[PDB]
PDB file of C-alpha atoms in Angstrom:
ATOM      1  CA  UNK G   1      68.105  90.161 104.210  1.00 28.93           C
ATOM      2  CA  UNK G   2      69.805  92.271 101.657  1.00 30.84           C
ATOM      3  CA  UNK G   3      72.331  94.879 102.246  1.00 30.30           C
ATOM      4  CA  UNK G   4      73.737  97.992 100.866  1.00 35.66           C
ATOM      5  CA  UNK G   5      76.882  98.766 102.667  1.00 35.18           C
ATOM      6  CA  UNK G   6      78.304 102.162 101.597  1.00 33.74           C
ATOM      7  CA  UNK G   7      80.218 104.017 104.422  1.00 36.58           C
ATOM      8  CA  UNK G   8      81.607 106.829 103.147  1.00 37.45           C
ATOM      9  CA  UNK G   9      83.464 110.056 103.272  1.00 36.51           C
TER      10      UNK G   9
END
């Protein structure tokens, strides 16, 4: 799969 990986603050 794809992924977006953005954790943020």
């Amino acid at each position: 799969g794809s992924t977006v990986y953005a954790p943020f603050t």
